Enzyme design. Structure first.
Site, PDB file in Angstrom:
ATOM      1  CD  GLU A 181      -3.893  -7.131   2.358  1.00  0.00           C
ATOM      2  OE1 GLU A 181      -4.891  -6.588   2.853  1.00  0.00           O
ATOM      3  OE2 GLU A 181      -2.652  -6.626   2.352  1.00  0.00           O
ATOM      4  CD  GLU A 194      -2.996  -1.287   2.159  1.00  0.00           C
ATOM      5  OE1 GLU A 194      -2.681  -1.285   3.340  1.00  0.00           O
ATOM      6  OE2 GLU A 194      -4.186  -1.433   1.708  1.00  0.00           O
TER       7      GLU A 194
HETATM    8  C1  LIG Z   1     -10.558   0.227   5.426  1.00  0.00           C
HETATM    9  C2  LIG Z   1     -10.065   0.400   3.991  1.00  0.00           C
HETATM   10  C3  LIG Z   1     -10.434   1.710   3.335  1.00  0.00           C
HETATM   11  S1  LIG Z   1      -8.230   0.084   3.785  1.00  0.00           S
HETATM   12  C4  LIG Z   1      -8.095  -1.647   4.243  1.00  0.00           C
HETATM   13  O1  LIG Z   1      -8.113  -1.699   5.693  1.00  0.00           O
HETATM   14  C5  LIG Z   1      -8.019  -3.086   6.115  1.00  0.00           C
HETATM   15  C6  LIG Z   1      -8.328  -3.075   7.604  1.00  0.00           C
HETATM   16  O2  LIG Z   1      -8.182  -4.379   8.077  1.00  0.00           O
HETATM   17  C7  LIG Z   1      -6.655  -3.669   5.721  1.00  0.00           C
HETATM   18  O3  LIG Z   1      -5.668  -2.899   6.424  1.00  0.00           O
HETATM   19  C8  LIG Z   1      -6.434  -3.491   4.198  1.00  0.00           C
HETATM   20  O4  LIG Z   1      -5.105  -3.871   3.819  1.00  0.00           O
HETATM   21  C9  LIG Z   1      -6.725  -2.062   3.718  1.00  0.00           C
HETATM   22  O5  LIG Z   1      -6.746  -1.980   2.278  1.00  0.00           O
END
Ligand SMILES: CC(C)S[C@@H]1O[C@H](CO)[C@H](O)[C@H](O)[C@H]1O
Ligand SMILES: CC(C)S[C@@H]1O[C@H](CO)[C@H](O)[C@H](O)[C@H]1O
Ligand SMILES: CC(C)S[C@@H]1O[C@H](CO)[C@H](O)[C@H](O)[C@H]1O
Ligand SMILES: CC(C)S[C@@H]1O[C@H](CO)[C@H](O)[C@H](O)[C@H]1O
Ligand SMILES: [Mg+2]
Ligand code: NA
Ligand code: NA
Ligand code: NA
Ligand code: NA
Ligand code: NA
Ligand code: NA
Lengths: 409, 204
Positions: free
Chosen positions: A332, A256
């Site tokens: 993921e 990210e």
């Molecule tokens: C909440 C989203 C806009 S971002 C989303 O949050 C998740 C929370 O578990 C993970 O961190 C993912 O990797 C992330 O893309």
């Protein structure tokens, strides 16, 4: 924050083994291999120094080689007088896989010609080839089906300090539940992790400690050359540390941080330094030029989510976009937050039907809840905000298949 | 525009088409069609024929057209719909989501077919949606797939018009007849009627 990993003191001779790299290549059907170990030294070069690399299967020494330092000619200026590469042939090697994690032991000895040891280093060696061919990720020539999970380093009492016991518990539970792979979300892990993966048998995605999620736009830093140096060391130092572990089968540029030129440059560095492992990276739409694998997060099976610039196509559809040929493994998917995993089977059915759908890493292994105590000393699981932290993201830290104490959901 | 070549009844289907002794007759059915129709703008693709398995002759003829008229893709379904004799994956009756893994000539789900390792061509069904009698169940499923997948570029329904023939009754009244109705035998009974419209063009 804090000193949350081990601290140790290491004594080395002044004339020492400063680095060693182990590689294994094979014939067409894997009934033959050659192990190549490049060794570098620091200290004073002397014509009487030697390096011996010997390979053992249990108690048996199956191969050994010895040579003085002085590598082959590299360019017009000559070669590395401070390095040497030993090449050992191995017939019918026992191959490494997560199904059968067969390992050999390579011992690198720095010594004198007359036989006196100066120092010895060593590593576990897994004979395995990782390659992408014709759009499929192959291990020892067979296409993988990644039953993966992303796992953070988390302990409800100890925070981010990891211990052997917890790691073994996690590995056993993973294997017991049919996982064969794990992604280091999203940083290199404690060194023991890799040893355990090598020996218990899990495929690993080793990931650089680089994530700039909160920037606007996401690649603000990653596209800026001024941040190239810092990112570079997070990638290169990871490879230099872990390149000899056979459980590591794929390198990852981080997570990210959008897609910026720094990522293309680092993708290339890895390709060049360690051709034995594919490189993946999801930022910037999951199919950029800095990834060998289409590795989306949360792309759905049938449903497209055409977001601008970084759409998340249905995985089935993604594979066949015009000109696309790479394998697709979600970095993921199946966000297990609370009462979740609805629709899980839908992914598995697709993975089994489409050759280029090679699985994914569920998000994620273990709830990051932390223990707090009430007035009577009774413990309770806390989440974002429970420590006075603000702003905070409340329960979003809890997305595991297992509760923090390892009890399953 | 399709050559007049169909050897469906041979066993295996490519018995004649893999036979160089039949290359000459086949060759004219392709070449003479190209010579005749090459100037029509409506003809966008040439086809080597139908249900004649996949034989070497098809490969020679495919190459001949590619040489003589590079302006139009060549397609051919026989032997598996994705052979070296076709520029387009052009299966007949492959389903949308369901694979039918017949040996030698599987009909994979059209969505899955596009992405098999190394596959790059567009997929346009040469026949689909067999409109035999009260049929067309599931037509929508195809359209949805065609719209979602760039490389799924449609298809040709099977088929336009019922091949029924008129007969006259005792009192001279006309009625629609099908196989076997002329004393013909063996015959394939109503299989001749698979259209979207009745023989007289009234729609189904
Ligand atoms: C909440 C989203 C806009 S971002 C989303 O949050 C998740 C929370 O578990 C993970 O961190 C993912 O990797 C992330 O893309
Ligand atoms: C593990 C080795 C025996 S593989 C060996 O490598 C050779 C080059 O050294 C050639 O490529 C052979 O074709 C190959 O089988
Ligand atoms: C006849 C079925 C087993 S094929 C099955 O149908 C599913 C819907 O239930 C999925 O869409 C799959 O892609 C397909 O393999
Ligand atoms: C019925 C099958 C065994 S053959 C099947 O028959 C259809 C009958 O309308 C069409 O002629 C198709 O083109 C043919 O493949
Ligand atoms: Mg111990
Ligand atoms: Na698959
Ligand atoms: Na908040
Ligand atoms: Na989270
Ligand atoms: Na389409
Ligand atoms: Na009959
Ligand atoms: Na018919």
């Amino acid at each position: 924050s804090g000193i949350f990993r081990d601290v140790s003191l290491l004594h080395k001779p002044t004339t020492q083994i400063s680095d060693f790299h182990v590689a294994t290549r094979f014939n067409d059907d894997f009934s033959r291999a050659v192990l190549e170990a490049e060794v570098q030294m620091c200290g004073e070069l002397r014509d009487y120094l030697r390096v011996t690399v010997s390979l053992w299967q249990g108690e048996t020494q199956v191969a050994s080689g010895t040579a003085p330092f002085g590598g082959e000619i590299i360019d017009e200026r000559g070669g590395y007088a401070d390095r040497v590469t030993l090449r050992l042939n191995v017939e019918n090697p026992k191959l490494w896989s997560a199904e059968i994690p067969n390992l050999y032991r390579a011992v690198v000895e720095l010594h004198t010609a007359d036989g006196t040891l100066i120092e010895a280093e060593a590593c576990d060696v897994g004979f395995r080839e990782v390659r992408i061919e014709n759009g499929l990720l192959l291990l020892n020539g067979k296409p993988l089906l990644i039953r993966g999970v992303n796992r953070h380093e988390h302990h409800p009492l100890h925070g981010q300090v990891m211990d052997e016991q917890t790691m073994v518990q996690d590995i056993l539970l993973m294997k017991q539940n049919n996982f064969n792979a794990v992604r280091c979300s999203h940083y290199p892990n404690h060194p023991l992790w890799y040893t355990l993966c090598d020996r218990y048998g899990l495929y690993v995605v080793d990931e650089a400690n680089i994530e700039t999620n909160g920037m606007v736009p996401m690649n603000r830093l990653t596209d800026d050359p001024r941040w190239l140096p810092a990112m570079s060391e997070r990638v290169t130092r990871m490879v230099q540390r872990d390149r000899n572990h056979p459980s590591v089968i794929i390198w990852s540029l981080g997570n990210e941080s959008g897609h910026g030129a720094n990522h293309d440059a680092l993708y290339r560095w890895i390709k060049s330094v360690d051709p034995s492992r594919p490189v993946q990276y999801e930022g910037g739409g999951a199919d950029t030029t800095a990834t060998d694998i289409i590795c989306p997060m949360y792309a759905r099976v049938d449903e497209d989510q055409p977001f601008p610039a970084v759409p998340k196509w249905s995985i089935k559809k993604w594979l066949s976009l015009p000109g696309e040929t790479r394998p697709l493994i979600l970095c993921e998917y199946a966000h297990a937050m609370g009462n979740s995993l609805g629709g899980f089977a839908k992914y598995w059915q697709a993975f089994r039907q489409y050759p280029r759908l090679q699985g994914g890493f569920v998000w994620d292994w273990v709830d990051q809840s932390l223990i707090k105590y009430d007035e009577n000393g009774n413990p309770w699981s806390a989440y974002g905000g429970d420590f006075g932290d603000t702003p905070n993201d409340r329960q979003f830290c809890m997305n595991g298949l297992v509760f923090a104490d390892r009890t399953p959901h």
